[PDB]
């Protein structure tokens, strides 16, 4: 037998006895005792038994000579034992230590610190000393085992149920104890060739295991090597159930099975940290549990932001390595993180599954601030709950086809060559992503620009196709720090794939979906913008199809030369298509190629450009939707537009099209809408070379604050099948409120045509130039002006109304109604012309104007000019009414006209009326009434041909000043063979009554001349006159 020898008690109190060669008994009296030994050896079959007053009592055995402590037999105590040997300690096979706590250390402790319960172990070791545990070291529940040495090796089994196991290589280790247990351990100080190796079984169920190795050198040598089994099952301790700490040097190599599972509760937390962490082929860090998973951190916390975990410089996880934080029955998946600052090599399998009977999938991060190689397998699916997320995070990510990337792991790979990267760029296998989408795991890819001077920028480049042929609905998000160049398609043949190709919150790059890289979601959404963050990320799409199926499409971006630029032959199919963007110099939305946008419900185009256009559609853009809305703003340019000398813009909205902006210039367009409407707010609107047909009402509103016209229609065909066409132009400068030119046809046979033009100053209201053909049930023209004219028809126009035609307006200095060109106003029922002027005329008909109707009504007022003026020496005015014609105003002058009427009557109230060089034939009466308050004549006829086929001719002139009440001159013929001719002339002062000059032939059944005068002649016959009557001729007056 071989028991310790040379024992001497140096502090505290207790006796040493050896009752048998095979049994030693150390009896402790004090709470803390320290004894020195010449050698502390225990032979096979021998026992050293401590007898301490309590489980909290501590016996220190300091070896002061001999060699290493050969412990081969059984060592037992009811309290804590601290063994210190500067020559290291060896526990052989079959040895057993059972105490209330046990510490083995090659570092010495001072008697003053031990006796005063200050358990600090530092220095004094022999170089190369090691503690090797080949036996079974156990404690009572709540105890602890600490092995402190330059080299620590565990080949046997260590058990500290409910307590702590600490294996550490450092210059100083401080143990903070309280009431019999271990509260904390402070491990500090690098040593030369530090190594902590675990080959056997370490178990601390419901406790903690700490493995710490602090090396001074070991550039690429192993400092922490775990090849056996570490068990720390139980509750989720927030400080970590298993903690591996490789220090600030060397490589940590784990080949055994870290575990912290909880069969009935939540899984625990396993933290593996060090400079270089290598997970070998058979490793399986597992932190699972019954009611939900735990957490596994390798090299860092989530995204490296957890301040309590040292970030690794390199993490390599070889193929075959498995990390599982999945839930096993019911509960959410846990968190797994692979983090490195320089290089992450991920080829293994990480699970974070939800429970089979409930719970959501967990989250797995595989990332590196530097070079991330993500080729392995991640599974964070759920059987009943939500899909989990696989997060990738690296400087610049490139997606490649397959795994054939000359990876290094087990073939042609000498130990530790895996930490020398050659695969520049964060290559990601497309197979892994596709496998994640098919297995119910979402994928989120992030990048981030590094310091100025490097190449990596966050440019996510897709060089391999992504597809989702199977599995439940998952999301795919690619949020780059730099560019989102997509060179391959992203498709889905099953489930919903939600694609989010957003930019980083502060990104300043571009998103390009180049070379036939069509995106199809099979019902998921396509988002290539942000939402509300003002992230100046532009979108450039070339020859790409975006097919959302029954999902939504939303594109946003802001740039300088373009916001969202489309080129090539693009196609967009969705339930909702929303394109929003911004620019400063160029076009916010710029569609230059051929594009088909086919929405089931709505299409919305929104944008803003300070100096350019908001929405610019020049290529062959075809937009089909239930509702199409085009809205935008521009200060110096256009809001909307469809201009292009070769392209045609086709819009098809089954319910309504509404367009808004500062200026909308529609053109070479073909627009079909239910209720079509425009609202231009700053520089008017223009419809040129287009065809616009609507089932229901068309409402075109525009305001112009500059030289351009408000509602400008050129070569446009506007039709309303069952509704009305209403235009409302406003001009605040000198442009025209409403302006028609070219070949324009307006058809509202089932509705109304209402054109409004409100101008200001010299601006005119509604101008009709060229050739304007308007057909409707009801036609109405309304307008206002100040110095210009309100309604001015100068070209050729045809108006065909199935009921009435109404022309109304007001012009302060111009004419209210002005017809100087050639026109045929044809109405089935009534034509009414009403307006007002101050200096100009109310109605001025100058060109060849034919008005045909059942009833024609002409009315207006002019303060200084004429009320009704039908005069020109070149043109002829033709009127054709079936029923009554009434002409009422301050002054009515009719010259060079041919009027056919049922009844006809004049009512002049201020300056009388004149008919000259005209033919007027009525079936019934021609009652001409006129009052004059000036020197002008009341009723004056010059070279007039007036005939009543079946009626009478009546005139009643009044002269309140000194003008002629009634006056005839020229060649006048009055024919009333079926009636009476009655002329009344009531003058005042020096004025005469009825004056007959020239040659006046009056033919009637009865003729009567009645009048009154004061100083003048009541009847004054100065020329030639013949009065032919079949019965009586009466001449009376005073």
């Amino acid at each position, epitope marked *: 037998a071989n028991l310790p020898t040379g024992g001497q008690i140096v502090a505290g109190s207790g006796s040493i006895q050896t009752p048998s060669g095979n049994q030693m008994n150390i009896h402790q009296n004090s709470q803390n005792m320290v004894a020195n030994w010449n050698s502390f050896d225990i032979g096979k079959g021998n026992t050293v038994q401590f007898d301490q007053p309590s489980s909290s009592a501590v016996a220190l055995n300091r070896v002061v000579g001999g060699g290493e402590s050969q412990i081969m037999g059984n060592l037992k105590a009811n309290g804590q034992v601290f063994l210190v040997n500067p020559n290291g300690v060896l526990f052989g096979e079959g040895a057993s230590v059972s105490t209330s706590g046990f510490v083995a250390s090659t570092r010495d402790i001072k008697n003053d610190d031990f006796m005063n319960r200050r358990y600090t172990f530092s220095g004094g070791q022999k170089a190369g000393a090691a503690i090797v545990n080949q036996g*079974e070291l156990t404690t009572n529940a709540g105890g602890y085992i600490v092995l402190a040495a330059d080299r620590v090796s565990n080949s046997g089994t260590i058990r500290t149920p409910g307590g702590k196991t600490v294996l550490a290589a450092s210059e100083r280790i401080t143990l903070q104890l309280d009431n019999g247990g271990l509260m904390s351990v402070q491990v500090t100080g690098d040593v030369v060739n530090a190594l902590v190796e675990n080959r056997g079984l370490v178990s601390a169920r419901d406790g903690q295991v700490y493995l710490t190795a602090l090396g001074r050198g070991m550039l690429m040598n192993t400092v922490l090597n775990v090849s056996g089994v570490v068990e720390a099952s139980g509750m989720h301790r927030q400080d970590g159930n298993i903690v591996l700490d490789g220090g600030d040097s060397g490589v940590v190599h784990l080949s055994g*099975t870290l575990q912290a599972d909880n069969a009935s509760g939540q899984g625990g937390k396993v933290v593996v940290q060090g400079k270089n962490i290598l997970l070998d082929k058979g490793s*399986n860090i*597992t932190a699972t549990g019954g009611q939900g998973g735990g957490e596994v951190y390798v090299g860092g916390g989530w995204q490296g932001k957890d301040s309590n975990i040292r970030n690794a410089d390199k993490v390599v996880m070889q193929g075959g390595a498995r990390i599982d934080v999945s839930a096993t029955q019911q509960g959410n998946g846990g968190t797994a993180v692979l983090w490195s600052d320089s290089y992450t090599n991920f080829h293994g399998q990480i699970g974070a599954k939800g429970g089979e009977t409930g719970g959501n999938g967990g989250r797995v991060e595989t990332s590196s601030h530097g070079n991330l190689q993500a080729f392995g397998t991640v599974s964070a699916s759920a059987k009943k709950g939500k899909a989990g997320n696989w997060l990738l995070d690296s400087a610049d990510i490139t997606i490649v086809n397959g795994s054939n990337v000359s990876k290094t792991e087990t073939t042609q790979s000498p130990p530790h060559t895996q930490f020398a990267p050659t695969a520049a760029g964060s290559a990601v296998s497309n197979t892994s992503i596709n496998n994640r989408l098919n297995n119910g795991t979402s994928v989120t890819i992030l990048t981030h620009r590094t310091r100025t001077g490097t190449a990596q920028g966050g440019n996510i480049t897709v060089n391999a196709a992504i597809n989702k042929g199977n599995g439940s609905d998952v999301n795919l998000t690619l949020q780059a720090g730099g560019n989102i160049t997509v060179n391959n398609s992203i498709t889905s043949t099953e489930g919903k794939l939600n694609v989010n190709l957003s930019g980083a919150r502060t990104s300043n790059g571009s998103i390009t979906i180049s070379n036939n890289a069509n995106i199809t979601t099979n019902g998921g959404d396509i988002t290539v913008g942000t939402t509300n963050t003002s992230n100046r990320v532009n979108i450039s799409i070339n020859n790409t199809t975006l097919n959302a199926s029954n999902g939504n499409i939303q594109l946003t971006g802001t740039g300088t030369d373009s916001g969202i630029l489309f080129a090539g032959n693009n196609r967009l199919t969705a339930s909702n298509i929303a394109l929003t963007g911004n620019s400063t110099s160029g076009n916010a939305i710029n569609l230059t190629g051929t594009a088909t946008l086919n929405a089931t419900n709505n299409i919305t185009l929104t944008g803003s450009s300070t100096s350019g256009n908001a929405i610019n559609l020049k290529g062959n853009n075809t937009l089909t939707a239930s509702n199409i809305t085009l809205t935008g703003e521009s200060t110096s340019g256009n809001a909307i537009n469809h201009t292009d000398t070769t392209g045609t813009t086709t819009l098809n909205a089954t319910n309504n099209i509404t367009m808004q902006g500062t200026r909308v210039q529609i053109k070479h367009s073909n627009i079909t809408a239910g209720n079509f409407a425009l609202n231009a707010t700053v520089a008017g609107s223009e419809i040129s070379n287009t065809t616009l047909t609507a089932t229901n009402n068309i409402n075109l509103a525009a305001k112009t604050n500059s030289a351009s016209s408000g509602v400008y229609l050129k070569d446009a065909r506007i039709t309303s099948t069952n509704g009305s066409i209403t235009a409302n132009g406003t001009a605040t400068a000198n442009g025209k409120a409403t302006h028609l030119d070219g070949n324009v046809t307006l058809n509202a046979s089932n509705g109304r045509i209402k054109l409004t033009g409100n101008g200001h100053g010299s601006a005119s209201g509604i101008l009709f130039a060229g050739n304007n053909r308007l057909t409707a049930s009801n036609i109405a023209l309304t307008g206002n002006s100040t110095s210009g004219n309100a309604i001015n028809l100068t070209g050729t126009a045809t108006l065909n109304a199935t009921n009435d035609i109404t022309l109304t307006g007001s012009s302060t200095s111009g004419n209210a109604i002005n017809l100087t060109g050639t026109a045929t106003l044809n109405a089935t029922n009534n034509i009414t012309l009403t307006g007002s002027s101050t200096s100009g005329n109310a109605i001025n008909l100058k060109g060849n104007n034919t008005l045909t109707a059942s009833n024609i009504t002409l009315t207006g007022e002019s303060t200084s000019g004429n009320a009704i003026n039908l005069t020109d020496t070149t043109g002829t005015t033709t009127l054709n009414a079936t029923n009554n014609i009434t002409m009422q105003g301050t002054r009515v002058q009719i010259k060079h006209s041919n009027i056919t009427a049922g009844n006809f009557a004049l009512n002049a109230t201020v300056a009388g009326s004149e008919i000259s060089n005209t033919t007027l034939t009525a079936t019934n009466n021609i009652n001409l009434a006129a009052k004059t308050n000036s020197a002008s004549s009341g009723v004056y006829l010059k070279d007039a041909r007036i005939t009543s086929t079946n009626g009478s001719i009546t005139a009643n002139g009044t002269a309140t000043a000194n003008g002629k009440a009634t006056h005839l001159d020229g060649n006048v013929t009055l024919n009333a063979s079926n009636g009476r001719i009655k002329l009344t002339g009531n003058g005042h002062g020096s004025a005469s009554g009825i004056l007959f000059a020239g040659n006046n032939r009056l033919t009637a059944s009865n003729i009567a001349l009645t009048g009154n005068s004061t100083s003048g002649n009541a009847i004054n016959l100065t020329g030639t006159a013949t009065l032919n009557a079949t019965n009586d001729i009466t001449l009376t007056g005073s």
Partner: antibody
Amino acid sequence: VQLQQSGGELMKPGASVKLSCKATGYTFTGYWIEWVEQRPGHGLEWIGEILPGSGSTDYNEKFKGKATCSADTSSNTAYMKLSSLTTEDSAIYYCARKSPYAMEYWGQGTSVTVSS
Amino acid sequence: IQMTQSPASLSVSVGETVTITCRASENIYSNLAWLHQKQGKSPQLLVYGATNLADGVPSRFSGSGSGTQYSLKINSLQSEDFGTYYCQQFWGSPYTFGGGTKLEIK
């Protein structure tokens, strides 16, 4: 990782045997080597477990006393002794490396036949 | 803890997906492994920890189950998949085994 086993044996009733299962390609002391009996009409039954490093063992209650498990860590091989074998103890005995989850890499098994 | 599995023997077609079930006499917290013993070979591990497959096992095998009721689903069964499958629990000391199920060619 490989777990080769000794070949079969023919034994007389009442004899004891000590079998063999070489462990290679992994840390021998870090995994448990579990011995399982396979018989026609019974399939597989667990026999016992040894942790070669510390020498800790665990046995099926029906096999206590009859079987003893041990290991030589220096030679990286696993031994099992079966005492007082009878006719009804003829079986194929497998050794396997067991990690916390699943007795992986089973060996080929030793056919132990007991007859007069 | 007793383990029962069924069917004891299944006659299946090549290319058919089949299910093997296993029931524990006590609640086993997912610590159920499945072994595959090809005729003439020692049993190999296919799925460990109820659902996690072992490396080298084709994706056609899928484990499932919880509580006391577990099963193994074999998609598009191939010729190499015939033989005897076993379930075993590590939640009890006797790491008991089921009686095994055999797949034979129909």
